[PDB]
Design a protein around this ligand. Structure first.
Ligand SMILES: [Mg+2]
Ligand SMILES: [Mg+2]
Ligand SMILES: [Mg+2]
Ligand SMILES: [Mg+2]
Ligand SMILES: [Mg+2]
Ligand SMILES: [Mg+2]
Ligand SMILES: [Mg+2]
Ligand SMILES: [Mg+2]
Ligand SMILES: [Mg+2]
Ligand SMILES: [Mg+2]
Ligand SMILES: [Mg+2]
Ligand SMILES: [Mg+2]
Ligand SMILES: [Mg+2]
Ligand SMILES: [Mg+2]
Ligand SMILES: [Mg+2]
Ligand SMILES: [Mg+2]
Ligand SMILES: [Mg+2]
Ligand SMILES: [Mg+2]
Ligand SMILES: [Mg+2]
Ligand SMILES: [Mg+2]
Ligand SMILES: [Mg+2]
Ligand SMILES: [Mg+2]
Ligand SMILES: [Mg+2]
Ligand SMILES: [Mg+2]
Ligand SMILES: [Mg+2]
Ligand SMILES: [Mg+2]
Ligand SMILES: [Mg+2]
Ligand SMILES: [Mg+2]
Lengths: 131, 260, 167, 155, 188
RNA sequence: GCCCGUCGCUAGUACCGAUUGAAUGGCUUAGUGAGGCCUCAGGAUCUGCUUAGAGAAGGGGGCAACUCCAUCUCAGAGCGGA
RNA sequence: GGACUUUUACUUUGAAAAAAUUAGAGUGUUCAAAGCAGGCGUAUUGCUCGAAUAUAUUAGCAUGGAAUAAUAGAAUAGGACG
RNA sequence: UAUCUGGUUGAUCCUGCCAGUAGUCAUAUGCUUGUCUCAAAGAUUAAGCCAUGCAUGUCUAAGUAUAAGCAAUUUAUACAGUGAAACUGCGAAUGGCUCAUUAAAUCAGUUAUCGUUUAUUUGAUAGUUCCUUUACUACAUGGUAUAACUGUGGUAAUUCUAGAGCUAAUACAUGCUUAAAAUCUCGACCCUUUGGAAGAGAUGUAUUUAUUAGAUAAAAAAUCAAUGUCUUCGGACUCUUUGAUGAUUCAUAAUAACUUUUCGAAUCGCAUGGCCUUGUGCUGGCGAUGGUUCAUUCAAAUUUCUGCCCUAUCAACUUUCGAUGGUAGGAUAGUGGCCUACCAUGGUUUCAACGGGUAACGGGGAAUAAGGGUUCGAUUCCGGAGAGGGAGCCUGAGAAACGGCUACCA
């Protein structure tokens, strides 16, 4: 008898199971940004899934509707605030757009490489984890 | 279920107490008294969760059992004393004087008041009757019983109270156009002058309200507390003066006050 | 070992339902009863032990009984009870007629005494005093608030007369 | 339903604490009592005129009406001084997003201060538990008969 | 024991209803006092929430009031003569509310032949004034004065003797008396 | 070419079936009826209130006459309680 | 305050409305699952934002609507107003 | 977050199911297993059975202390510090577990008490107690009977207990009291009028009964019976007073009485002071426990409207031994066929009664993501039921209690 420690999981695994094309693309994305799982991709594309979802749902509501404005602007400002969404396309018909790579390009893994400091994505992995 | 319940689980506990989910499994169960369970504020919540004056519960019993706190006049030695709306929590030491009053969010707020406003109180006369030996009386929402009141004193009126003695020093009727603090509903906390009473014989009389921001709304007469004249209040309201800014209004205000 | 119980007759044993205040049962809970066995009130050879009580002393002193006397442990603790173990009339002052028990602290021999309850003392008279006082006081107070209201209503009626006169 | 007799029981029938003094030469023999129920259902003239007792009458009885006020279209009067109405409605099933014809039969008490036949729409109001099943009592007849005398013989 | 619930009992459709929970004290009932006559013998009972109820097995005297005379006296209760619920209560001379009893009569005579100075059936100065101010106001009534001749007045009970330990009532009169008389003799 | 039915072997499932077959559970007639509760009684003991005697106390205030309250102690008697 | 009121369905808005769940805002638990925290200086004797909003439907109450679909009304005139 | 793929033919295109595919706050099991945080867990089967231990007891300056208890000191020759045992008081009805029965029951949203109980908390509330009423009733305080204890005992055995000897109270059982005023009844006298009167009793609260007030829907009169205040003695009465609700016989009050008479402080702790007619007079500070009636608060009990899974291989059900209604009582805390008595023949049903099945507690909810749906909820919160099966009950404010008792079955 204590408050239920809540949770929820953080990934969405592939509908189809053995799709060559998608597998290729996955292994690519892993091999660029230095990831170990396909799950590390699943998780990402899932966050993407929910986000784009509420985007659609907001965009069915009427323009200049209270919810649409509050949560729309909130979502946008949030996305940008960590640097995934472009300042230019700052009105959520491009948050509906987006894509996965754009999400990937914000990882500490990656940034610790983009500005040198590692010269190798895997060196990024190991350096990061090693204090 | 064979008798009365003497425990209170968390999550059962009224949300307007603002307790956190973990940290245990129960909350303090309000005792019996002046204010109803589902709409009060036990001394321990206040002295621990609102003021952060004591860290434990043990320390609240420690403080209390030394008569530092006194309620509406008297001392009170009940960790879970049911303190509620319109009351007065005095700290004799520390020099501090509190009136228990609601937010706009509908929560009980800490609110610092004067040494002198802490000498009296306001009580909505919930009932007015005739008693033994002819003595009429009036009884107020905090369970005050006052013998011999002004015959003009009805039901749904409000009343200024000595605290020093008991007696009523002045009373405000329930008329079209009078300052009203809403106790209960979603519009609990808002304050808005009164437009007009929808009668409805037999059940649930309605009260039409509008604040000083030309916004309207409606609540049961049940949940209406007469507190004065347009602009002229009879006690020190708290910040925000119960006006209810929109989600947008508060996103802008809270995020305009941003310069360091 | 089962005990007897006065007035059950029957030279046998039976199983009665017992209560508070009754022989051969001390309860364990407020309004508890147990049904227990009992031996009758009619003597038989089934009896391990008779328990008897002298009422007339015969013609020969039994050794460890009519040769020895043994005190009654305690003495009178209540006001009048003392006054009736000495017969004093509510006059001769209790305080010194009480029973004082000696006992040694090795070389510090002490003497201890009861606590004469229901003794008449100044403090109790002060309390009686304040009772009656508080009563009359609040009574008068009531009368006066009552009058005050009476006026209130009377010179409210005066106001209705004035208002009814205005038109 | 009653009709006739009034004093037709093993017990004497009368209103409670309504002393009529015999020493005084009254013109109406029996002093009567009554009220109006509230909410605006005129305590009909048949009640004050009448001679009956029924301490379950909402106007001459000692049973107060409060709570739900319902209407319903009477379908049973075979029970002395009480009747059964069939209140009808349409119930909404979500899956099909439609309605089905439903109904329930409430037994109500009815003071003889109303004459009723089957067909007449009625307006009843909740009172205390009166019988095992009677939780309501008759307060207005929003009808009359439904043209029975306009169903007469020939020219 | 006796449970005044409605969880026994068929539904109004006559369906048969299942044991749901056992018997509880709060829905209980207790047995009849079946109060009788002679030698006051009352036993309290520990009702719910502290509170006594006074259950009166056997009574003899009761407080009976002359409704249209302004008084109330105490009298030996004679017997019970008529009862609308059950004839047995009559043969068994049981006392319950609304039982038709007979009473002493003589106290109401001692009061009447004092306050009125008229004497039923068949000297002081102030007194003269009183008895003088009181008449055409002393026609009494036929049947009532008749019962006064009998020595035995018909009255109706009002109290619940198996609840309050009391036996109280009002003398029969007028239409009520008319009723219980016509019943008294069309069963005589 | 396909393919149908009896017949024959192996294995599995269900069905009918003497035994008025068997078992479990839930209601229930009739008969029997523990126990607490209520009530009429009972009276192991154990005191009340009233009536009177005998031995002494304490005085409402007198020179003899006169007289209340409480308290203990046994032959003996009326009206109730535990 | 008196005197009376044809019955309904739909729909609107709203009152009444537990928390935890869920959708969701704020906040960088080092991330995240979460949590309802925390954030500012004179970090020597305090300053301070919070602890939102949304759903909550069937029924019941309350309120606007008068389309769509019913229901009742005057024909042996026992009609309508005064 | 709106997809399909294999398998019927020589080939084909359909119908169609099998298999594949994905997730499961969905169990299990096999293989493997390094770090952080998080952390469900004897539900399903068998509400089957249980060894041992523990899970309910509790004290303030303030009810009871002659421990033959410890401490001694610090004023205490009645008590006083501290305090075992015991008495008294309160609690043990919360909690925790389980989900067996339960299918209009529970539960849910929504009503009801003008239909009841209520420990406690908080706010109020009490001058009335005696008696033929001057030779008075303890009020400066009335009664014993009990544990513990001491001592004598019994049984193989238990939270078994007997006989004897003491003694406490906020236990048990009693029992005094307080101002004024008024209104009611009687009424000794005196005197004839139009009539008045010394003074005698009664009148706290509660209980029971009968009667009465409690107005108001706009305004005026004559007369019978009583009968109130003021005479400018034909006469007048003028001002006249009223609560709450949609709604009452409501709150509230008055009259005649009723009652093995409810309550109306025989309690406790810290201080000790004023004040003269110097009585240990007469008063008096803070606050504790109580106490009747009212209100509150925690509750409870019933209760209105609507909503439940499959089933016709269940179509009629309901009164044997209440089924539906009426009158009266009895019972209850209280309404009510809850029960009894008499009286009647009613109540439900194809708009599915009634019966059956549920590997059925109801909800908040969970899972599955076009939507509409489909499946699930024993299980952290709410509500309910039970404690191996039943039934019965004592105590109490509160239980049909089971870490309570009594009986039956096992
Ligand atoms: Mg508490
Ligand atoms: Mg209401
Ligand atoms: Mg004492
Ligand atoms: Mg009938
Ligand atoms: Mg009997
Ligand atoms: Mg078998
Ligand atoms: Mg038997
Ligand atoms: Mg689809
Ligand atoms: Mg093939
Ligand atoms: Mg071929
Ligand atoms: Mg199990
Ligand atoms: Mg000592
Ligand atoms: Mg519990
Ligand atoms: Mg004794
Ligand atoms: Mg009946
Ligand atoms: Mg009843
Ligand atoms: Mg029927
Ligand atoms: Mg089940
Ligand atoms: Mg289910
Ligand atoms: Mg469940
Ligand atoms: Mg199960
Ligand atoms: Mg479990
Ligand atoms: Mg139980
Ligand atoms: Mg078991
Ligand atoms: Mg049990
Ligand atoms: Mg156990
Ligand atoms: Mg238990
Ligand atoms: Mg057997």
């Amino acid at each position: 008898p204590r408050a239920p420690r809540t949770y929820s999981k953080t990934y969405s695994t592939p509908k189809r199971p053995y799709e060559s094309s998608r597998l290729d693309a996955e292994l690519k994305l892993a091999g660029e940004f230095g990831l170990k799982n396909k799950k590390e991709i699943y998780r990402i594309s899932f966050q993407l899934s929910k986000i784009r979802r509420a985007a659609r749902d907001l965009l069915t509501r009427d323009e200049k509707d209270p919810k649409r404005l509050f949560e729309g602007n909130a979502l946008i400002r949030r996305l940008v605030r960590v640097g995934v969404l472009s300042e230019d396309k700052k009105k959520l018909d491009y948050v509906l757009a987006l894509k996965v790579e754009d999400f990937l390009e914000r990882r500490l893994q990656t940034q610790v490489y983009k500005l040198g400091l590692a010269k190798s994505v895997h060196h990024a992995r190991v350096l990061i984890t090693q204090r | 279920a064979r008798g009365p319940k003497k425990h209170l689980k968390r999550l059962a506990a009224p949300h307007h107490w603002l307790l956190d989910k973990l940290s245990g499994c129960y909350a303090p169960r309000p005792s019996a008294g002046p204010h109803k369970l589902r709409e009060s504020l036990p001394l321990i919540v206040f002295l621990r969760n609102r003021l952060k004056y004591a860290l434990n519960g043990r320390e609240v019993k420690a403080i209390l059992m030394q008569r530092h706190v006194k309620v509406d006049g008297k001392v009170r030695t009940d960790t879970t004393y049911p303190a509620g709306f319109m009351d007065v929590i005095t700290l004799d030491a520390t020099n501090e004087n509190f009136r228990l009053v609601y937010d706009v969010k509908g929560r009980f707020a800490v609110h610092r008041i004067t040494d002198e406003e802490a000498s009296y109180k306001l009580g909505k006369v919930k009932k007015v009757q005739l008693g033994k030996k002819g003595v009429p009386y009036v009884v107020t929402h905090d369970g005050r019983t006052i013998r011999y009141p002004d015959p003009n004193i009805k039901v749904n009126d409000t009343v200024k109270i000595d605290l020093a003695s008991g007696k009523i020093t002045d009373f405000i009727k329930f008329d079209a156009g009078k300052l009203v603090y809403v106790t209960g509903g979603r519009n609990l906390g808002r304050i808005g002058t009164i437009v007009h009473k929808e009668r409805h014989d037999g059940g649930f009389d309605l009260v039409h309200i509008k604040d000083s921001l030309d916004n309207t709304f409606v609540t049961r007469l049940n949940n209406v507390f007469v507190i004065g004249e347009q602009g002229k209040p009879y006690i020190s309201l708290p910040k925000g003066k119960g006006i209810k800014l929109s989600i947008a209004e508060e996103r802008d205000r809270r995020r305009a006050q941003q310069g360091l | 070992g089962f005990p007897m119980k006065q007035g059950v007759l029957l030279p046998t044993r039976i199983k009665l339902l017992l209560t508070k205040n009754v022989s051969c049962y001390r309860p364990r809970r407020d309004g508890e009863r147990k049904r227990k066995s009992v031996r009758g009130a009619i003597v038989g050879p089934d009896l391990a032990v008779l328990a008897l009580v002298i009422v007339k002393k015969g013609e020969q002193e039994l050794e460890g009984l009519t040769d020895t006397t043994v005190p009654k442990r305690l003495g009178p603790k209540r006001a009048n009870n003392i006054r009736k173990f000495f017969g004093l009339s509510k006059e001769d002052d209790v305080r010194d007629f009480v029973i004082r028990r000696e006992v040694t602290k090795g070389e510090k021999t002490y003497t201890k005494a009861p606590k004469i309850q229901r003794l008449v003392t100044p403090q109790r008279l002060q309390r009686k005093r304040h009772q009656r006082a508080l009563k009359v006081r609040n009574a008068q107070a009531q009368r006066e608030a009552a009058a005050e209201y009476a006026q209130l209503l009377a010179k409210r009626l005066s106001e209705r007369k004035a208002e009814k006169a205005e038109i | 339903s009653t009709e006739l007799t009034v004093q037709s029981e093993r017990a004497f029938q009368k209103q409670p604490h309504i002393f009529n003094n015999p020493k005084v030469k009254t013109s109406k023999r029996t002093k009567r009592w009554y009220k109006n129920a509230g909410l605006g259902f005129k305590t009909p003239k048949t009640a004050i005129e009448g001679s009956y007792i029924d301490k379950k009458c909402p106007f001459t009885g000692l049973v107060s009406i409060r709570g739900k006020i319902l209407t319903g279209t009477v379908v049973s009067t075979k029970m002395h001084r009480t009747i059964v109405i069939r209140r009808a409605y349409l119930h909404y099933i979500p899956k099909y997003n439609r309605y089905e014809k439903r109904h329930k039969n409430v037994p109500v008490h009815v003071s003889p201060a109303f004459r009723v036949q089957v067909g007449d729409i009625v307006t009843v109001g909740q009172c205390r538990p009166i019988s095992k099943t009677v939780r309501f009592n008759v307060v207005k007849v929003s009808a009359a008969a439904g043209x029975x005398x306009x169903x007469x013989x020939x020219x | 024991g006796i449970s005044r619930d409605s969880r026994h009992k068929r539904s109004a459709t006559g369906a048969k209803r299942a044991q749901f929970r056992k018997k509880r004290k709060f829905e209980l009932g207790r047995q009849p006092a079946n109060t009788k006559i002679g030698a006051k013998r009352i036993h309290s009972v520990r009702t719910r929430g502290g509170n006594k109820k006074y259950r009166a097995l056997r009574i003899e005297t009761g407080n009976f009031s002359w409704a249209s005379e302004g008084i109330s006296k105490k009298t030996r209760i004679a017997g019970v003569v008529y009862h609308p619920s059950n004839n047995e209560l009559v043969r068994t001379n049981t006392l319950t509310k609304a039982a038709i009893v007979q009473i002493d009569a003589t106290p109401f005579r001692q009061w009447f032949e004092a306050h009125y100075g008229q004497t039923l059936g068949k000297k002081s100065k102030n007194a003269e004034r009183k008895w003088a101010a009181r008449a055409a106001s002393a026609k009494i009534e036929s049947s009532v004065e008749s019962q006064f001749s009998a020595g035995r007045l018909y009255a109706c009970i009002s109290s619940r003797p198996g609840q309050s330990g009391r036996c109280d009532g009002y003398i029969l009169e007028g239409e009520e008396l008319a009723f219980y008389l016509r019943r008294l003799t069309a069963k005589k």
